[PDB]
Amino acid sequence: GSHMMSTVCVYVNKHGNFGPHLDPKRIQQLPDHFGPGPVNVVLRRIVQACVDCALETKTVFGYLKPDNRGGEVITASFDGETHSIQLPPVNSASFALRFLENFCHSLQCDNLLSSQPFS
């Protein structure tokens, strides 16, 4: 007797900031928004988009450890190899927004998304 994860909608603003630990061109390639869709997939799709776009992904992939709670999965390219980690599982809509808020902060990227919908 338990529901699924929550739902959110971010608006990926490539006019805001790119990184500068993220490739500015790939920041213009990725979509205009992620949502409306599930909390856990919206947060991971910002994060792994950033790590994939990342200048010096080898170091950027250090700003997220594998978290053995068994939540989401971030994929990336390190030393020519393809490496993936685990995230913690979420159920609150605030934790979507707050998850990538911490990660983008360590990359100095901000205004790259906006959880506030145009209704």
First to last CA, the chain: 31
Domains in the chain, number = 1
In angstroms, the CA 108 to CA 110 distance is 7
Dihedral angle sign, alpha carbons of residues 92, 49, 54, 75: positive
Query: 76 has which bridge partners?
Result: 83
The label of the residue with tokens 């990926």 reads 12
CATH number, position 49: 3.90.1150.190
In angstroms, the CA 42 to CA 97 distance is 9
Please list the alpha-helical segments (H only) found in 8-92: 24-29, 39-53, 57-60
In angstroms, the CA 90 to CA 71 distance is 7
In order of 38, 96, 109, the CA distances from 5 in angstroms are 7, 10, 27
The label of the residue with tokens 């947060």 reads 43
At 25, is the secondary structure helix, strand, or coil?
Answer: helix
Q: State which residues form the domain around 118.
A: 1-119
Method: NMR
**70: its two tokens:** 């068994």
In angstroms, the CA 34 to CA 44 distance is 10
Percentage helix, strand, coil for the chain under 3-state DSSP, each rounded to 5: 35, 20, 50
